[PDB]
Design a binder for this molecule. Sequence first.
Ligand code: KC2
Ligand code: KC2
Ligand code: KC2
Ligand code: KC2
Lengths: 170, 170, 170, 170
Amino acid sequence: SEIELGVTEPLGVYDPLGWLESEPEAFERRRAVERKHGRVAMAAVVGTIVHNNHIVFDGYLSPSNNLKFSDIPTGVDGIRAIPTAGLAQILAFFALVELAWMPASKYDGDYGVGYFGTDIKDPEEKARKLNVELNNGRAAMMGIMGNMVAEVLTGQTMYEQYASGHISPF
Amino acid sequence: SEIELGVTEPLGVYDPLGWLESEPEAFERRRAVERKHGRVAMAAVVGTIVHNNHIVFDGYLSPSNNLKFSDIPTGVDGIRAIPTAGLAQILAFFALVELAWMPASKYDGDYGVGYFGTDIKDPEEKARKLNVELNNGRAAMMGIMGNMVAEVLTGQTMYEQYASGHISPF
Amino acid sequence: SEIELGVTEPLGVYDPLGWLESEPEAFERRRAVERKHGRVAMAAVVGTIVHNNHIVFDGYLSPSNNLKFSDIPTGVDGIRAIPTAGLAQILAFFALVELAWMPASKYDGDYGVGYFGTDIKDPEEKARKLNVELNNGRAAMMGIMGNMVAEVLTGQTMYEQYASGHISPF
Amino acid sequence: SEIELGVTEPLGVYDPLGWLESEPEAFERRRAVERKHGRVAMAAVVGTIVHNNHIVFDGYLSPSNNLKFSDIPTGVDGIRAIPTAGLAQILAFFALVELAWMPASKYDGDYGVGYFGTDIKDPEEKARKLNVELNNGRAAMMGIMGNMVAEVLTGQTMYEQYASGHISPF
Ligand code: KC2
Ligand code: KC2
Ligand code: KC2
Ligand code: KC2
């Protein structure tokens, strides 16, 4: 029932380059990659929205570096501002996650957590929720790409872009 | 089972002008219209209650127009105070909704979201919840009409009417 | 299955005066009365706890009477401090409730709202929850009686009794 | 199905001492003890985390002793700081719990409250949740032991240890 997921109006089965029938055996991992990217991009978009609203922690991210949370830029440079030891800690934690707790090798993406802890018994409701996850992931992928591109070209974070009234490109 | 919905005590099947039997084929769309109006009026009544409590966003609705959120009147003139571009954006978003996401042409009103996400498996509980939705929509329709009429006849918003002790018409 | 409800450890079927077998036909209304009193007393105990923590509304209960919410005593005189028109409004609203929406004549006490909106499908879980409701109602009945009696005897509300260290009767 | 609980990756059935087959009849109470310790240690770890974030009640724990809540140390001396009468009250309340409401003699640890009030109908989901409870209890046991040992050896509470940058032992 996985090959039926992600087929939603108005496009239906949208395979413009025709890879569903050309490479039928690769669809499992391609959908795994699509779902992984969708989840990551949804988290990233929520993160950007939180950042540019200046919802930051109170205190120091790295007291040894004298680096407060509010000192971290809200744009694409935020991850670069983090100290190298902090990036190492993030990488170690997500190595543990991605290799043990929710392995990326599990292509169905089903790690037992369900939707808010509970399995969706109704097949129609479960299919609709899975389609919602896929479509929101696709929208978030396009959105995070657009956010990063706009920040890189305009030169301003989303907060700075909105606060200066620079919404119109022309 | 749709024709049994909305039949509740103390009125039961209340058709004073006798259109259930006179026009049996029009009931589907008439109930669709009733449910749509009920949902819209419930949202409108909650909106009026929020407005007259002065629960407003902090900032500017339209910085180019120098129009803060608190500058928008809490009465029937609130929607008129919004800039034309903002009204255009609201209209475009709801055109997308009403034509694609939750089409108004779907007369059963079932867009797959269920009641707080989950389908109601028990037929009795589902019928009770649907009757609750219909009755609350009817009450909200009457309430929003009464609120608008009282504001237009007294010249005061609900907050101004209550704060001045003008809740007695005589 | 109603006659099995309220039978819980350590007392089991506790009928010290032997009215379950003496008047088997009166048990339905007696359990209705017990459940009604339990619900009312649970609400009353929560109300007293809220009052004596000075969690009060901000504003005037009756601006014509120049009576603020904080002016209402938190003890047994609180309901007496309310203006007569306010008591009339409360009585009218609860007449509507108790006669139409959740009639007191419905001895099973099942008004369709369920436990947090949902019916409890598991008979064991449902029986346990009903026993919990009954036992908490009994405890709240005893508690509200004790609170009122202690306030009347000591001359102080619960807040005044606790704040003065007058908890020990001797 | 209890003997299958707690068997999780990567260790599977981890019995280095070989007591599962040496003493098959003692496993019921040993798992009861393990689950009890897991729950107690999870509560203790949450408590330590709350303490060292200085999330304390506002007021006096014991006005007669002139002992505010903020005066109670956040480390291992917190339970020693509270007055003897308060310790007696805590002990009495938990005697009532552990002997009547959720008896420790019930080795299955099933007191009818379920997981957030509801029984888990799906056997796979229920087994996963029980394994989660056991593994989190084991992790919390190790964590609370480590927290207490680190505090007793460094001489500082967790807040004092973190605030001084004394996290690195060398
Ligand atoms: C991925 C999630 C994550 C987890 C689960 C996690 C857990 C723990 C634990 C418990 C096991 C401890 C004890 C601990 C301790 C410290 N952390 Mg964490 N930490 C995470 C992320 C980051 C990031 C992003 C940064 C960071 C930092 C520090 C500093 C530096 C203070 C200073 O330098 O004095 C110290 C002492 C910053 C950094 O090291 O900067 C040099 C920084 O940027 N940490 N950290
Ligand atoms: C229906 C819901 C809705 C959505 C989903 C939505 C999304 C976005 C997005 C993201 C796609 C952007 C980037 C964006 C941007 C701006 N909006 Mg929205 N907007 C919505 C509603 C309104 C309303 C009601 C108003 C309004 C306004 C502005 C202004 C004006 C600022 C200024 O003039 O400098 C700017 C820049 C106000 C207005 O245009 O007044 C002339 C105003 O009244 N918007 N808006
Ligand atoms: C039972 C729940 C309940 C409901 C559902 C409810 C609904 C409404 C509605 C909407 C239909 C209106 C329009 C309305 C209006 C007023 N109420 Mg309510 N009211 C309830 C309870 C009380 C209580 C307890 C009191 C009270 C009061 C007033 C005053 C007095 C202001 C003043 O005197 O200027 C006015 C104008 C106080 C009182 O009348 O004191 C003389 C007072 O004590 N109300 N009330
Ligand atoms: C285990 C949970 C628990 C419960 C369910 C519970 C219920 C009640 C009830 C309702 C039945 C009353 C009426 C009551 C009253 C007092 N309690 Mg509780 N109390 C609990 C725990 C503690 C702790 C830990 C302490 C404490 C205290 C006091 C004091 C002291 C004030 C003073 O000295 O002036 C008074 C009057 C402190 C203490 O006695 O210190 C000498 C203190 O440390 N209590 N307590």
